[PDB]
From a paper:
The response regulator VbrR from Vibrio parahaemolyticus, a member of the OmpR/PhoB family, regulates virulence and antibiotic resistance genes. VbrR is a member of the OmpR/PhoB family and contains an N-terminal receiver domain (RD) and a C-terminal DNA-binding domain (DBD), connected by a flexible linker, and can directly bind with the promoter region of exsC to mediate its downregulation. The VbrK/VbrR TCS is activated by host-derived nitrite during infection, which leads to the downregulation of Type-3 secretion system-1 (T3SS1) via repression of its positive regulator exsC for maximal virulence. In the cell or solution, VbrR proteins exist mainly as inhibitory dimers formed through the DBD, and phosphorylation of RDs allows the formation of RD dimers, which in turn changes the conformation of the DBD from an inhibitory state to an active state.
To gain insights into the DNA-binding-induced conformational changes of the DBD, we purified the full-length VbrR protein and used it for crystallization, but the crystals obtained only contained the DBD. Finally, the DBD structure was determined to 1.45 Å resolution using the SAD method. The structure of DBD forms a centrosymmetrical homodimer. The DBD homodimer interface involves α6-α8 from each protomer, and extensive hydrophilic and hydrophobic interactions are identified. In contrast to the DBD in the VbrR-DNA complex structure, which forms a compact and globular conformation, the separated DBD structure adopts an extended conformation with dimensions of 31.8 Å ×36.6 Å×72.2 Å. It is worth noting that the DNA binding motifs α6, α8 and β9-β10 hairpin of DBD in the VbrR-DNA complex structure are blocked in the separated DBD dimer structure. The key residue Arg190 from recognition helix α8 forms two hydrogen bonds with residue Asn184. The structure data are consistent with the biochemical results, suggesting that the DBD dimer binds with promoter DNA much more weakly than the monomer. Therefore, it is conceivable that the DBD in solution intends to form an autoinhibitory dimer conformation that precludes DNA binding.
Numbering used by the authors:
A (entry chain B): 127 to 220
B (entry chain A): 126 to 220
Write the structure that this text describes.
């Protein structure tokens, strides 16, 4: 099946892309990103989400890996004074 | 000089041993690397992206910057492609 947008005609089966009438050569990764955005018009994705959805889950460390490792440190070192700064990151107090 | 010591915590960099409140603590390699980094930088706030680079290694695998440069590549190869940059959050294709 094909996916159409204003400018794009994308073939999911063959990885072929037509842009305003012209056939476009994309890398595999470029293609997956283009197709992901083109299949989800009007929706904002964070860079973290796009990394996950396009490059795949669990192939290399991400910002989630960082959060998971902090939680694991907290369990193995009870009372470890790592402060969470909601929506930024972490700080060790003492 | 092999050791970093903070409250209740003793970390030996050479032998990679962690003593917390008098107990030897078993950590994976990256748990250790993360702990030692934070203990060596008390009072300092790091973003998750910074911790990734400092602890897991800078420029070793795809990151959020790889997403940014791939959007630039798409915009170059498809001149006029309507990807919107929502600065400091991410990306949206309008239509």
């Amino acid at each position: 099946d094909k996916v159409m947008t204003k400018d794009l005609e994308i073939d999911r089966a063959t990885r072929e892309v037509i842009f305003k009438g012209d056939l476009i050569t994309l890398t595999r990764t470029e293609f997956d990103l283009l197709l992901f955005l083109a299949s989800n018009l009007g929706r904002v994705f964070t860079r973290d989400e796009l990394l996950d959805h396009v490059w795949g889950y669990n192939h290399f460390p991400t910002t989630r890996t960082v959060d998971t490792h902090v939680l694991q440190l907290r369990q193995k070192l009870p009372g470890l004074e790592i402060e969470t700064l909601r929506g930024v990151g972490y700080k060790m107090k003492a």
